């Protein structure tokens with residue numbers, strides 16, 4: 040086993056967070072489409088795809104390090120009941136997920152696994168972009184009002 | 196005469212429903228255009244055209260089965276006085292139409308007219324898509340407010 | 352109500368005639384297709400489409416004049432049992448329909464609704480073109496014989 | 508062995524019907540070409556090709572289900588002596604074929620082989636289209652006369 | 664609530680099977696890539712994508728029927744230790760999946776949800792195509808030998 | 820009857836051999852596809868098509884000679900159970916078939932039917948090309964081994 044055991048555990052934890060996000064964002068996307076909020080549905084679909092790509096890269100790295108990728112354990116999805124709750128739930132997931140990424144990067148640095156660190160840092164940048172998007176949407180609801188915000192997300 | 200008599204009666208019942216829908220949706224479309232709600236006008240125009248295409252297929256099938264297509268009997272149009280009533284009236288019509296489609300499909304299955312069943316199932320899929328659209332629009336009125344909903348349908 | 356009440360009644364009468372023609376010509380088209388007389392089927396399809404376009408223009412004018420377009424009342428279709436009867440029935444409809452158009456134009460002129468008159472005159476020109484076609488087809492049956500006439504309308 | 512034994516027997520029965528049709532239509536096609544009725548020759552060629560495609564799909568399905576496709580048993584060809592007899596013979600064959608298709612579909616439904624049912628329903632739609640063509644041609648002989656009907660099928 | 668409760672339960676059962684397959688096939692794909700068997704890796708990737716598309720359609724249908732799609736419950740993945748075990752595990756999963764699909768289709772038919780039945784039949788056709796592929800690969804291992812079979816799947 | 824009676828009998832015998840070959844090669848093709856030996860499946864499909872083209876030419880010649888083409892009598896297909904047996908069965912058919920072609924050519928020469936002789940000689944050349952292919956494949960099995968030979972025919 041070339042990989043550090045705790046690096047592989049961290050990568051499996053990040054992978055687990057990505058698997059939650061894939062499903063949460065995909066369901067939220069299709070809920071927004073069901074409600075006719077097609078601009079939100081499309082954006083959230085692309086967020087789900089992005090997490091799928093991150094999961095792929097993590098799986099590939101874990102296998103290279105001779106670990107066993109964990110696609111069996113799926114943690115808790117938090118599905119919102121309206122647009123505000125869904126955006127907030129995605130934000131909660133990302134805030135928790137970025138904390139785990141930082142902890143994983145610390146450990147990779149400590150054991151000199153600089154390539155795993157670089158992979159995690161690229162994922163972290165994408166997740167901070169998603170936090171930027173989510174916080175901005177919640178702010179727009181405050182600034183333009185919920186009804187206007189939803190109206191602006193009806194059409195793609 | 197090759198067609199089962201009750202199959203032909205069912206197909207003419209579905210055809211009669213299509214003829215109601217053609218006219219109700221065409222009038223609703225032109226009412227929305229008169230009011231300057233051009234996006235609703237255009238969508239409802241396309242709903243009317245889709246029902247015209249279904250009527251065509253039913254007429255063709257009835258003639259193949261050596262029945263007499265009934266284009267004479269036009270049942271009650273459900274014409275709303277405002278956008279919410281018009282959408283609800285279209286939805287009520289579609290719920291009646293899908294009930295009749297299911298009863299026709301049962302009978303086609305029982306007498307082994309599988310090609311008529313397949314035609315009716317294709318129509319049913321299209322009518323359920325219309326129900327999806329209509330329920331979604333009524334939900335959007337609740338989520339964004341009536342005035343915003345109408346505003347979003349002014350421009351094509 | 353900007354529209355003259357009797358103008359709107361005349362426009363609804365013309366619209367009623369167009370609704371009969373749409374369905375009569377559409378059924379005749381599909382009967383000719385069922386019989387393999389594809390050239391007649393295609394021509395009659397385009398006659399039906401033309402009447403659909405006239406109906407649309409009438410509906411739009413009635414709504415502009417603040418009348419209620421009548422798409423509920425469908426008058427008597429006269430469906431022929433063979434090619435000669437079908438052509439004759441279409442001709443009967445057009446002869447009756449053009450009489451109603453002339454009466455409507457007289458009234459529009461009387462009350463100075465020159466734009467409604469112009470719309471009706473454009474429809475009248477199209478209907479006289481259809482009479483030209485129909486009389487010519489019936490004459491061809493006399494000149495070339497029924498069997499040859501039908502033969503000449505097998506292929507598109 | 509995954510296939511239901513009686514499903515495979517039904518599929519081989521349908522395959523046997525297709526093999527009859529392939530040969531009957533191919534010979535009728537080449538008879539019409541020999542007689543200079545090239546449009547009938549070409550249409551009947553394409554009917555034979557369509558049956559070849561159906562046979563291919565049946566063979567593929569039987570092999571997937573771990574049955575033995577029967578390409579050995581060739582039932583009685585119904586070869587006409589003139590155009591009217593050839594068309595009537597094709598029609599008689601197709602009426603027998605659709606009876607067998609309906610019985611096969613019933614059995615597939617009963618044992619939950621829904622993919623075989625869907626294949627057979629697609630074949631049935633194609634055979635009913637052929638019945639439509641054949642009944643139409645026999646009707647045209649009556650409407651335009653035999654000599655005109657043949658004349659109309661000299662040139663492609 | 665428009666959906667039949669047991670239909671929704673069946674659709675969520677099928678969805679749960681798709682979620683297992685997505686992850687099992689994605690991991691098998693990346694295991695094959697890790698081992699340098701790039702053609703197997705690519706084929707299995709595309710199998711995983713196809714299951715993703717099926718899951719999407721199921722989620723959309725469940726939401727239309729006013730049910731709650733279950734993306735939370737992930738059943739047992741069947742992960743093989745070598746190529747033969749991985750293919751057999753995929754085959755075992757697919758045989759379970761088609762059993763559940765047939766039971767769902769029976770129920771949809773019984774309650775006249777013909778559009779859900781049509782969706783499930785399309786999924787079933789795709790899963791039987793996968794069974795065809797898998798049985799064929801296991802047969803090829805026997806016919807060409809394991810080492811040759813793997814060699815043939817090194818290069819894309 | 821312009822054709823020599825025994826020429827027509829010979830042409831019907833060759834046609835009979837072609838009808839066996841069409842079905843034998845088509846089934847063998849689809850068996851190879853079922854087994855994932857796609858290169859063999861495709862080659863054998865094209866052999867079947869080639870025999871279909873020969874059959875067409877024979878049918879056309881027989882009709883020109885005022886004979887009755889025999890598409891009713893189908894002789895014995897010999898379907899192999901594995902690749903070696905299938906190749907050997909195709910070779911057996913071709914060896915028998917070419918003997919019949921030579922006998923037919925002798926007779927055509929004797930009665931001065933040089934155009935039928937030329938047609939048969941063109942078919943004979945194609946059949947000798949097929950013998951060349953078949954003998955070569957059986958030789959390759961001997962030279963590279965069965966498992967390698969099959970491996971080389973997995974991919975198109």
Ligand code: HEM
Pocket residue numbers: 214217218221244247248250251370373374377400403404406407422
């Ligand atoms: C008031 C009654 C109807 C109106 C106002 C109407 C109006 C129209 C209009 C405006 C079009 C588009 C023509 C164009 O610009 O190309 C159209 C197309 C068509 N209509 Fe109708 N229609 C009516 C009834 C029917 C009926 C009863 C049928 C069949 C039974 C039918 C079948 C069609 C078909 C097949 C098309 C062509 C659609 C396509 O493939 O593009 N319509 N109709």
Ligand code: HEM
Pocket residue numbers: 526529530533556559560562563838841842845868871872874875890
């Ligand atoms: C006397 C018997 C048959 C004759 C004379 C015949 C003749 C032909 C001919 C002339 C073609 C067109 C080839 C070309 O120019 O491209 C053709 C195509 C074909 N035949 Fe046959 N055929 C026969 C039996 C069969 C059978 C039994 C099958 C399957 C069981 C079959 C399957 C096909 C297929 C799949 C094609 C290709 C069609 C396409 O996709 O373009 N045929 N046949």
Ligand code: HEM
Pocket residue numbers: 058061062065088091092094095110682685686689712715716718719
């Ligand atoms: C570990 C779990 C999953 C992984 C690793 C994964 C991975 C991927 C990857 C790599 C792609 C291709 C993206 C691209 O390059 O364009 C993709 C596409 C897709 N995935 Fe997933 N996915 C997962 C779960 C899901 C789930 C649960 C769904 C739906 C419920 C889903 C639906 C899709 C869809 C719709 C596409 C787009 C396919 C297309 O139309 O091109 N995936 N996935």
Ligand SMILES: O=C1NC(=O)c2cc(O)ccc21
Pocket residue numbers: 107108109110111112690740741742
């Ligand atoms: O998610 C997984 N990674 C593995 O290596 C594995 C093995 C297994 O038997 C079940 C699930 C999993």
Ligand SMILES: O=C1NC(=O)c2cc(O)ccc21
Pocket residue numbers: 222272273274419420421422423424
């Ligand atoms: O054809 C119609 N034009 C209308 O304005 C209308 C209203 C109504 O309740 C039913 C039918 C119709």
Ligand SMILES: O=C1NC(=O)c2cc(O)ccc21
Pocket residue numbers: 534584585586887888889890891892
């Ligand atoms: O294969 C055939 N050629 C023919 O002329 C013919 C006639 C018939 O009644 C049945 C079969 C066949």
Ligand SMILES: [K+]
Pocket residue numbers: 187190343346
């Ligand atoms: K607004």
Ligand SMILES: [K+]
Pocket residue numbers: 499502655658
């Ligand atoms: K003539």
Ligand SMILES: [K+]
Pocket residue numbers: 811814967970
């Ligand atoms: K090798």
